[PDB]
């Protein structure tokens, strides 16, 4: 808001402001803009389905233990543990619609919490997607690549069973598909023993979680860092406008307030062109993440190194708070013999 | 570059579904591409195994799947249906019939058994002209 | 509202945001420092002896009522040199502290009173620092001080060893040693009196006459002011928005009261926004906590002018238990409160929408809202606020035994459009 | 470096220059972030063995 950030609580200092013409209007443009292309990235992420597929009620997956991706009923929610595991590790998410203004009269310590520095004309604005949504599209997902096979991205969805879809999955890949025939229980128990072992490994370490966290650690210091600059003199008289108005005369202050007011919109457009920098590197990487999500997961991918560390055998979407977590499972040669060859 | 000059086996990449070729076309400060892609259509329910034993030994088709109507069994290429009798195209043993789940019991009739069965038919009759009298 | 600031007729079917609200003050509160007697300026400005230049007098002025409209006429103050604090709103401000430093200067240079100039009068009697915060008074004194047989008794200097820091006095006088005999004797090479009487006869030039010169000096924003305006108090008024104006901090918004504690010096109390939160009453002295009233964006949702004119008005993020405390008269700076006496109300997790009615029914999204409820112009005609459909919810079968295969298929045609080059341009 | 640049050797204009707050301690972060991701790009690149 600009008229209370740059021209807080005095009437001719915004008829001054009005005066200057239509920066904080252009401003306001770049800020609706940024924020409908935010929303469309994960509007155009997860809308790869049409139809919101129902899991079947039957869990025996071939003997493929399966319960800690599905959604647990359970749970209030539609999450699975990971992703409540995902969600609340990162716990610093987004209160901007929770503070209403009780709770900015709450008093915990003289108003010392995010009200204080969202008095100056900043607010946050809700996504439009919400998180049982996002749980549902990504359930749907799921529910779609674990019974339907892969047809499912090209039209309409035809059942195909697990064994013979591994089978299909290992024939594309360069090894003939009967070998799966006789590895079933020892391929099931090492799924299940890597699928623990990734809760285990999420659950280990503190320092895993970074990629998420780096962003929403950058916008509160963006955020912290433009309502701390508001101190600044910049060669003025007193910080504070009000002091300037009632000390001095109104044909010599002028050019105080100009210098400040002038000041304080090249801090706000300094801060708009670096979100509109960080909102073109969050562009590619969610048009990497839509393209991974298409390629890996709709279908096999015979690029090597794409999607995942060796050859590429299929792929899981999880949701994450502001982020996308994939597990590819992948296949990985053992050890070996050599012989003489010709 | 990828999807004019050639057929893109990357899925949903030069058109919705399964992709067959694409033409350009200009436009002012832009380019228009005409994606031709192929859909499935209504599908049909059947009911199938992962292999079949004949003769005491597994069989396993190398594209496509074992489908039955209830009365026969067939081998059938995944995107389009068409039954056919065992072909040799679709048919190598790899060990016995006792490890696999799911396996019934048929007549193997992939072109390598039709060399002793039927591709030989002419033959058979000629051999049985003398044993069988 | 949305056609002035689209600057269109004809707007397109969507959302809009437009000019935020505000809540309006009520009335206007002062609160000063409550003293009976005049500050005593008389005594200070009819001295019958002034001081000299290198023996100035300074006098500290305390608990009293700065009271300069007397001082307009009398006193008639011939120098509006005034350039810390404008001299028209002097008495608009409250000083910690004012000192008054009085003496008599040649008439020829009065300007080198200012600030920055240098000389000898200048520099080597007295000067004023660089961060100066105050104003000179100087005026002729011909009648009085200057007499027909010479006013011989201000003494001025006219050298030193080094140049002196501002605010700084000297008594002694010394005969001066300016070589490498040590001249301390009577007299000498450079050996003379530092202090020199004055020459002054009416009968001299033009602007060579005595004048009398008086600084004042104060500084501001540091404690609980004794001397200021003749202002009158008020009542103190509780949880309601106000104009307050406490020792010349001019600010709009309420006041609580504050479980914080203070101490017997700190007056003020900041906040990491360089912004005033916490204030202790002059008069009766517990803590008051400022906080300006709520605010937020307003939006618009209508449908295209091709269609009606009947919209939906959004409020950013407020507690709908709350906005019927806006819709008053003369209450609020937006003064369309037409559609603010309009119809049910409906919250969602940003606010809350009035013009629209909550259908358990599921469509298709049209136009964003938040939190996924979305708006439409339907069914009579009217807006209606949803609940957004993920699409159609279609069981699959999954079978351990079965295969679904099709028979048919199709060729379909697909259009992908690509921006290739933006225009050039050149300036 | 924020100082040498703008107001060296000169005590005075860098007195003036601390009332601006913290422009040039953004610049710097600015910088050390491209810099850090620029031999990221390299480490990337280079380090698939
Ligand atoms: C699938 O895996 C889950 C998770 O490992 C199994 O749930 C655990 O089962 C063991 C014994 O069956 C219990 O001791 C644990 O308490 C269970 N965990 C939880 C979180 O409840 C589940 O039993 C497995 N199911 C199959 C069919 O293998
Ligand atoms: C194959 O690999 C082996 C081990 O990496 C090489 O070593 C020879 O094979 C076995 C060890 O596995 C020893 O008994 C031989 O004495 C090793 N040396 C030689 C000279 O045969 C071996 O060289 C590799 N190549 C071949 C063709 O066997
Ligand atoms: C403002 O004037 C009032 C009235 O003189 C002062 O009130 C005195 O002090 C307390 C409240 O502050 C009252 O209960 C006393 O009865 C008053 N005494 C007298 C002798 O008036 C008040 O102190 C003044 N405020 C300031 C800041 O000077
Ligand atoms: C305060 O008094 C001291 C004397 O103790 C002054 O210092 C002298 O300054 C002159 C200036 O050239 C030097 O020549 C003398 O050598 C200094 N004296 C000593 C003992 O070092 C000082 O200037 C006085 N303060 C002011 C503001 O004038
Ligand atoms: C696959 O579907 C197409 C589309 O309906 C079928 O084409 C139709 O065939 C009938 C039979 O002669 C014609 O009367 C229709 O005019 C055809 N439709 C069109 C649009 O030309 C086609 O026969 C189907 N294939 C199979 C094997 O059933
Ligand atoms: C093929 C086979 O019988 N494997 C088993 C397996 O349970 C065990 O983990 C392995 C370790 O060497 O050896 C034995
Ligand atoms: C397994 C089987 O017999 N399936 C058939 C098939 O024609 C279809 O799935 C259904 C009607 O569409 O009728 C039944
Ligand atoms: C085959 O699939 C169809 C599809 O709905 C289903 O109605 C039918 O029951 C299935 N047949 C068997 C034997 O499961
Ligand atoms: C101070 O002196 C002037 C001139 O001598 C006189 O006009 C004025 O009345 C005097 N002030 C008071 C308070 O008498
Ligand atoms: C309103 O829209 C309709 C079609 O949606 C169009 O035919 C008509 O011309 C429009 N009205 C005007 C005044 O242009
Ligand atoms: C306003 O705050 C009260 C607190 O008791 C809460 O019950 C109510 O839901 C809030 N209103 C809205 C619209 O959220
Ligand atoms: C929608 O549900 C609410 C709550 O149960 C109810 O009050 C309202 O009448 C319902 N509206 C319709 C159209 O069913
Ligand atoms: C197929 O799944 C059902 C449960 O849905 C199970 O009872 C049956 O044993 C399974 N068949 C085979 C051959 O595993």
């Avoid at chain 2, 059947?46 to 067939?74: L, M, Y």
């Avoid at chain 3, 689209?6 to 003050?25: A, D, H, M």
């Avoid at chain 3, 002295?285 to 307003?298: A, H, M, N, R, Y």
Wanted: proline share 5%.
């Amino acid at each position: 808001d600009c008229t209370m950030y740059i021209c807080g609580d005095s009437t001719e200092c915004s008829n001054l402001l009005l005066q200057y013409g239509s920066f904080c209007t252009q401003l306001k443009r770049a800020l609706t803009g940024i924020a409908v292309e935010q929303d469309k990235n994960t509007q155009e992420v997860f809308a790869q389905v049409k139809q919101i597929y129902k899991t079947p009620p039957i869990k025996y997956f071939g003997g493929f233990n399966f319960s800690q991706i599905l959604p647990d009923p359970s749970k209030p929610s539609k999450r699975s543990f990971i992703e409540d595991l995902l969600f609340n590790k990162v716990t610093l998410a987004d209160a901007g619609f929770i503070k209403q203004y009780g709770d900015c009269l709450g008093d915990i310590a003289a108003r010392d919490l995010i009200c204080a520095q969202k008095f100056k004309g900043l607010t946050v604005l809700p996504p439009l997607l919400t998180d049982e949504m996002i749980a549902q599209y990504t359930s749907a997902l799921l529910a779609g690549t674990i019974t339907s096979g892969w047809t499912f991205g090209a039209g309409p969805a035809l059942q195909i069973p697990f064994p013979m879809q591994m089978a299909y999955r290992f024939n594309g890949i360069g090894v003939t598909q009967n070998v799966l025939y006789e590895n079933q229980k020892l391929i099931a128990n090492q799924f299940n023993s890597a699928i623990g072992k990734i809760q285990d490994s999420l659950s280990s370490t503190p320092s895993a979680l970074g990629k998420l966290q780096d962003v929403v650690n950058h916008n509160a210091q963006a955020l912290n860092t433009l309502v701390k600059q508001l101190s600044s003199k910049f060669g003025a008289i007193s910080s504070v406008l009000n002091d300037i108005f009632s000390r001095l005369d109104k044909v010599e202050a002028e050019v105080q307030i100009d210098r400040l007011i002038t000041g304080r919109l090249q801090s706000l457009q300094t801060y708009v062109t670096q979100q509109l920098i960080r909102a073109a590197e969050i562009r590619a990487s969610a048009n990497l993440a839509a393209t991974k999500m298409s390629e890996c997961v709709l279908g096999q991918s015979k690029r090597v190194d794409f999607c995942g560390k060796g050859y590429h055998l299929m792929s899981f979407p999880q949701s994450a708070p502001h982020g996308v977590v994939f597990l590819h499972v992948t296949y990985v040669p053992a050890q070996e013999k050599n012989f003489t060859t010709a | 570059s990828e999807c004019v000059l050639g057929q893109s086996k990357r899925v949903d990449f030069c058109g919705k579904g399964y992709h067959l070729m694409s033409f350009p076309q200009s436009a002012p400060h832009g380019v228009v591409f005409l994606h031709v892609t192929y859909v499935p259509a209504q599908e049909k329910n059947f009911t199938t195994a992962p292999a079949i034993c004949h003769d005491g030994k597994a069989h396993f088709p190398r594209e496509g799947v074992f489908v039955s109507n209830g009365t026969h069994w067939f081998v059938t290429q995944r995107n389009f249906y068409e039954p056919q009798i065992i072909t040799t195209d679709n048919t190598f043993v790899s060990g016995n019939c006792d490890v696999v789940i799911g396996i019934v019991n048929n007549t193997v009739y992939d072109p390598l058994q039709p060399e002793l069965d039927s591709f030989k038919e002419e033959l058979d009759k000629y051999f049985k002209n003398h044993t069988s009298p | 509202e949305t056609k002035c600031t689209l600057k269109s007729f004809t707007v397109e079917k969507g959302i809009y945001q437009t000019s935020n609200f505000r809540v309006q003050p009520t009335e206007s509160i002062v609160r000063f420092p409550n003293i009976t007697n005049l500050c005593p300026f008389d005594e200070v400005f009819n001295a019958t002896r002034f001081a000299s230049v290198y023996a100035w007098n300074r006098k500290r002025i305390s608990n009293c009522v700065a009271d300069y409209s007397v001082l307009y006429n009398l006193a008639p103050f011939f120098t509006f040199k005034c350039y810390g604090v404008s001299p028209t709103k002097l008495n608009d401000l409250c000083f910690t502290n004012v000192y008054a430093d009085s003496f008599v200067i040649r008439g020829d240079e009065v300007r080198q009173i200012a600030p920055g100039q240098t000389g000898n009068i200048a520099d080597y009697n007295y000067k004023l620092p660089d961060d100066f915060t105050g104003c000179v008074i100087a005026w002729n004194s011909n009648k009085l001080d200057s007499k027909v047989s010479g006013n011989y008794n201000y003494l001025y200097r006219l050298f030193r060893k080094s140049n002196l820091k501002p605010f700084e006095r000297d008594i002694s006088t010394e005969i001066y040693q300016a070589g490498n005999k040590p001249c301390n004797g009577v007299a000498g090479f450079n050996c003379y009196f530092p202090l020199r009487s004055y020459s002054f006869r009416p009968t001299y030039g033009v602007g060579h006459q005595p004048y009398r010169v008086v600084v004042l000096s104060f500084e501001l924003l540091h404690a609980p002011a004794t001397v200021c305006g003749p202002k009158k108090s008020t009542n103190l008024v509780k949880n309601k928005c106000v104009n307050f104006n406490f020792n010349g901090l001019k600010g709009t918004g309420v006041l609580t009261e504050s479980n914080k504690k203070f101490l017997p010096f700190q007056q003020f109390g900041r906040d990491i926004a360089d912004t005033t939160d916490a204030v202790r009453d002059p008069q009766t002295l517990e803590i008051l906590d400022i906080t300006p009233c709520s605010f937020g964006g307003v939006s618009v949702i209508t449908p295209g002018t091709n269609t009606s004119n009947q919209v939906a008005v959004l409020y950013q993020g407020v507690n709908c238990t709350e906005v019927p405390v806006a819709i008053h008269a003369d209450q609020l700076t937006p003064t369309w409160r037409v559609y603010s006496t309009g119809s049910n109300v409906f919250q969602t997790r940003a606010g809350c929408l009035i013009g629209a009615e909550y259908v358990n029914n599921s469509y298709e999204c049209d136009i964003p809202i938040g939190a996924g409820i979305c708006a439409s112009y339907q069914t009579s005609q009217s807006i209606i606020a949803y609940t957004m459909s993920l699409g159609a919810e279609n069981s699959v079968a999954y079978s351990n035994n079965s295969i679904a295969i099709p028979t048919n298929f199709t060729i379909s045609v697909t259009t992908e459009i690509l921006p290739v080059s933006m225009t050039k341009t050149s300036v």
